[PDB]
């Protein structure tokens, strides 16, 4: 099963310098330039965090 | 960059070259720019501001091209709506996209949903020509998937990375047939690629482009044409000689069997055949395979190699890069990524994920399987489903 699509997997939420959020499998090393802000937690929990916390899809550089 | 910037270069270099051919009507680059500036002035005059979304409900025409550029000049993004869509999809797309105004024609006026401003493109109004200007990070368009359709938000930089890509090899002498729905991102090739290259857009006559109409267009001077996979397969099996005279035929989207390409090459030794692959989320196409004149395809039609400026990765279930000949998940990175899905932050975070190969960058999860060849081409290996 694809690791990003495993509804039973353990996940993080990562954010980059542009404020963009990413789901991430908790078993995998966090890529450079990204910071974990939530998890390990269920996939639905992480997606709910993104829905609640990523309110503006525009990259931060655009807004500033 | 932005497509308006690339187009402005062509207006400066050759203002009197033909830009758009629509039946009797012919627009030069200068004429296209001037008309778009006037419609842009009408939009600014109404208070349209940077980042606003303007829906578009028009039949393909020179006015369509003018309208799209005009929305861009006003600092806004276009939301293309096919005039053949049923009313519920039109209404959903307009509301979902946050479009507050809709450009239409006399013929399509009744298709504007109630409560949305109808702007009839042929109406003349007391506003001066003006442009706010397009900027690379700003929204250029919102195009909807074939699924509940999702709104893909694409910035100017990504459209320009696609349209201005040197690999298209479109020249000022080229004439590209325009017939795909402008609500589909193949229209980026049919409209913007020729205009940023100095060539001309030839608006197809109303109705579907079949083999007979393709032959007639080629006789009138069309040099390049895109066909959907379904149409290409049908013409390749039924009348492959109908591509004769084209400099290049392009296709992609759905499955194209190698046999279909082989038939066209057999009938048309000199036509370049470009097979293209890519989701709307990465701006029309991310990889392509070009069969040069005289060359034979062989048993498998690759989806090919990333476009210049783009990267592809084939990773296993632990996100490790696999060796050639091993099937894995296909990820697309580098140029051309959308910002994400409108109103769907979670879905965006689920498919535009962190890219381990480039600091701070994202890659789009295609949901497709692929394998590398030893020489760096990609073979499609089905859906991860
Ligand atoms: C233009 C085609 C190569 C692919 C198109 N972007 C699609 O998603 O169907
Ligand atoms: Na996709």
Author numbering:
A (entry chain D): 2 to 65
B (entry chain A): 9 to 155, 159 to 396
Sentences copied from the publication:
In this work, we have sought to understand the evolutionary history of lipid II targeting glycopeptide antibiotics (GPAs), a vital class of nonribosomal peptides used in the clinic for the treatment of resistant bacterial infections and exemplified by vancomycin (Van) and teicoplanin (Tei). Since ANC1-3 domains display polydisperse elution profiles in size exclusion chromatography, we instead turned to the characterisation of an Acore construct of the Hpg accepting A1 domain from Tei biosynthesis (A1tei), which possesses a homologous pocket to ANC1. The MbtH-like domain Tcp13 also exhibits the anticipated fold, containing a 3-stranded antiparallel β-sheet and an α-helix adjoining the centre of the sheet.
To understand the effects of the evolutionary mutations seen in the binding pocket of the ANC A-domains we then mutated the residues of the substrate binding pocket of A1tei to those seen in A1ANC2 and A1ANC3. Comparing the A1ANC3 pocket to A1ANC2 shows further refinement of the pocket through additional substitutions (L287M and V295M), which serve to improve van der Waals contacts in the binding pocket for Leu. ANC2 and ANC3 were both selective for Leu, with ANC3 showing 1.7-/3.8 fold higher kcat value for L-Leu/D-Leu. In terms of A1-domain evolution, our results indicate how the alteration of the Hpg binding pocket was driven through three crucial changes in the binding pocket that together eliminated Hpg binding whilst enabling the acceptance of Leu.
